[PDB]
Each structure stands twice: as structure tokens, then as C-alpha cells.
């Protein structure tokens, strides 16, 4: 709790810093690697591929103006011709809207049967509550009540 | 002239397990400078990645042209990544030093 | 009987009007009604990239006559000092707004250069133009008024 | 803010013209623009609201001593249908970050 | 099935042919244009 309130004080103070600066002079404000580690969930890695491709990313700003003013185009050739994809299969798994994938992606992968990760994995019964037939919603609802 | 829900972060999927960050930086590097990019190295998250740009409109042109764009045999899933959700793994702190600095250097 | 009332009135523009209506700062030189990109005007010409009309830029550093890059023009571009200006220029003599290059429609898709009234000016074929009018450019013409660290040339894509 | 929801109950229910509540007046040009930004001035608001008509004369209330706007203006057009158009149209508008309000008088 | 395999192979070969004949042309065009530009700058110097 003292930490909770400590956060609001810092929040208002940064508001006074930014607001003040304009007088002295949004969501697009540049970010820090701890702030970067703050957003994304567990289990991901940061990559450099090169130092050189990274220098391309740094020149990219300057080259977003520069290389957009330069030669470029795309074309296709006529030639004869694998196609993987995932819905939510198991037995049934009522359908996923194209956005909801972000939430339910963990259910899509078929890796199965090896603790908590299996409780989150089995907790996708939510999906059965959200979308599905009314009976699936009923039975799912009870099953999650008793659990 | 933009929908509010879109954000500088894009969730990208339908990636191979062999895929190289060279192709990543090259391809995605069209629209703007990369803030950075993460890739799942973990058993479930392998095949997924997150891209973050110095500007949103970068990402907007990206999902515009990169929509269902192709790599190898695959058509990548390109979505605007959500916010909040799982955050509090990290904390709010370390504001004191930087704020003391801006209060020191410029004196404001 | 010096100043009857201390306030009176204005009847004048407001900073938030012109501000909000043009922002990257606020900018000048809002595109005219005609402006259209050159590629789509090559599409109404029925021209694939082979026979299409694309204006490429050519650089020569004014002291030493080539490419630091090569630049396509294919509806307008903001030539300025570097962030606001799209066509950033390292030249230290360029005002924060130096000039603009707008392709416009007359009778055809034609390139145009317009000075923003940069303090120094700008030289065309080593011959300056006066501010505040669109001046058509023809191929092989040169841009740098007298502070000139660079040069520029224009080319249509052919051969 | 309440206006726009009255125009929606007027359009949704099929009010069909002359029973319109702009027929409440018929006698009045002068319009009320409140919630205006303090940087604004005569020539400006004239330039924005001459869109829907020709404004004859506007008195914007500006505090007598300090000589700055109190934040609203009473305006007068040459045409009433310009007033009907302006209240029914130009309302709920963003100016300099703040949404102005308009209504008859 | 044989006709399809050999046919695809042949058309592929013809493709790399057309591409190989194309790139040389592109570079010839860029060199030509660069020559025109250098001549233009020289005419700008004198």
C-alpha cells in the first residue's frame, strides 16, 4: 500500500515535469529497456541479428525519408508451385475470432501431457464460456464454479 | 485519422522455428526504425514474435502492406498487440533518479 | 487623449487555428488542390515501371562534383533543415523551413519547386528565383541563393 | 452536448421539418458560442463561422478591465437559415482542444 | 506427371534466363543515366 501511494506521487510529479517543460519550452514518448521488460509477459528474448542490421534500423529513420526517395518496385513471374495453419483443433473447441487468437494462442499448439502451466492451459474453458453453443456455456460455467 | 486500439507493438505469428532475425530486421525494417523485437524461445511461444517501432504510423503502414504477407510457405499473422494484461511482473519504480535529474539539469 | 481605450480589438488570425490546421511544429506551404503523386499519374498514363515517368534525384557536393544517395520524387516533399522536415538537409544555412517541391497538375503531372522564403534564398541553375510562386522544373535543371554546400539535379527515368 | 441528442431524437422519430425546434424562434439571428478558447478573437471566429452564412456583427464578451475574452461570443448573421444551419451543424466542435457550444438566443 | 515435372523445370530455366538477361539491362540503364548526370554536372561547371 505505501508503495501504491508512492506510485501516485511519482505519477503526478512526472505530470508536473512534462507539463512544466512545454511551458519552459503522449503515448508515443520513447521507452526504456526496463519499461520494455515491463510490457511483454514471461519467456521472450531480445535479439540483435547483426550489429549491422541494427545500424540499418538506426539509419532506417533517416532512410525512411532517404530510401523511400529511391529506386524500388516489386514484380512477379509465372511459375508452377506446405501451407501450415492452425484453427483450434482438439475434438471440437468452438471457434476463435481472428483477434481472440492473441489471448487463446496457448491453446492452439497441440503439445500435451508434459503443473501451473497445465492449470492455465485447462483454464481455457473460459473460451468455452465466451464463444460456443449455449450448452457448452452452461456446463463450462458449472465446471469452473466447482473448480 | 487512426483507430485508437492500434499500438506501436505488433504481435506476429506463423513463423518458422529456423527463421533468422536477419530476415526479420530486413523485411520489417521497411516501414520505420525498429524500437526492438522479441521472439519466443520457449516451448509454447516458439514461432511467435513481437515487433516495436519508434512510431505507430510505421506499424500502421506495416500491417497495411504486411497484412497476410508471405514468408517461406507461410502467411504471417499480423495483429496489433494489446496493452496492460500481464505487466506488473515489473514495477513502477526508479522514477526518483531520472526525475531528480530533469529537476537538476534543466532545474525545472 | 493619447489612448482612449487600452484594449480595442484585433480581427486577426489565431495561433491555434493555423497551428492545429497544419502540424507535423506548425508548418507552412499546405499543398494546393492539384497535388497528386507521380506514380498514379503514370497509372492514368497506362505506364508500367519500364515506361513510367519517375523523377530521380542526383546529388553533387557543391565543392566536389556524386551520389551520397539517389532520391525518387514519386505528391510533394518538404525540403528543410535537420524533427519536422521530411527532406532533411545537413546544410547549416537552410532555415528550419527552407523550401518545398510539389508535383502539381496543369493542362499533366509536372514537377514544381517553391521557395518558402528562406532567409538566404535558393539558386536555380545558379540563378535565383523570387519567393512565393510555383516555378516549374524541367529535367537536368540544378538546385543548390549564392552558403551553398551542395548541388542537386533532376532526371526522368529513361534508357 | 445535450443538443446533439435532441437532434437524434428529432431525426430518429421522423420529425419532418417545420415542427423542428429551430422553428421555436424564427425571430432571431444572434447565436451563442460558449466554451470558446481564450486566444480566439473577432476576425478568427468570423472566419470560421462565415462558412455557413455571412455574419453581420458579433459582440464577443471580453472582460472590460483586463481586456481578454470571458470565453464566449454572441454573434449575428445576415440570414436565419444560417443560424439554423450553424446551431444544428457547427456544434460539438473541437477548437484548440476544447469543444465549443452553440445555441440560439 | 513426367510432362509436368520436365515442363516446370524447363519454364524455370527459361525464367532464370529472362532474369539474367534483365539484370544486365538494368545496370546498363543505371550506368547510362549516371553518365548523363555526370555530363550534366560538367556542363554545369563550365
> Any idea what the shape of chain E is?
rod-shaped
In terms of DSSP E residues, the strand content of chain A is: under 5%
Task: Give me the count of strands of chain A.
Answer: 1
Gyration radius of chain E, in Å: 20 Å
**Beginning-to-end CA distance, first to last residue of chain E:** 68 Å
Helix content of chain A: 40-55%
Number of helices of chain A: 8
Globally, the shape of chain A reads: flat
Please work out how many helical segments of chain E DSSP would assign. Answer: 1
Taking Cα atoms only, what radius of gyration of chain A do you get, to the nearest Å?
A: 24 Å
Q: Helix-strand pattern of chain E, N to C?
A: H
Strand composition percent of chain E: under 5%
Q: Structural class of chain E, please?
A: mainly alpha
Largest interface: A-B, 49 and 56 residues
Most strands sheet of chain A = none
The major pleated sheet of chain E works out as: none
Our measurement of the CA-to-CA distance between the termini of chain A, rounded to an integer number of angstroms, reads: 30 Å
Tell me the number of strands of chain E.
0
Would you kindly provide a written description of the structure presented here, covering whatever features stand out?
The structure is cut from a larger assembly and holds chains A (147 residues), B (108 residues), C (159 residues), D (105 residues) and E (46 residues). By secondary structure, chain A is mostly helical. Chain A is built from eight helices and one strand. Chain A has helices spanning 2-15, 17-24, 33-39, 53-65, 101-108, 116-122, 125-130, 134-146, and one strand at 45-46. With 159 residues, chain C is mainly beta. Helix content of chain C is 9%, strand content 31%. In chain C, the strands form three sheets. In chain C, strands 4-3-5-6-9 form a five-stranded mixed sheet. Chain C has a four-stranded antiparallel sheet with strand order 2-1-11-10, with no helix packed on it. In chain C, strands 7-8 form a two-stranded antiparallel sheet. In chain C, a hairpin with a 6-residue loop joins strand 10 (142-143) and strand 11 (150-156). Chain C is globular. Chain E has one helix and no strands. Chain E is rod-shaped and about 70 Å long. Chain E is mainly α. Chains in contact: A-B, A-C, A-E, C-D, C-E.
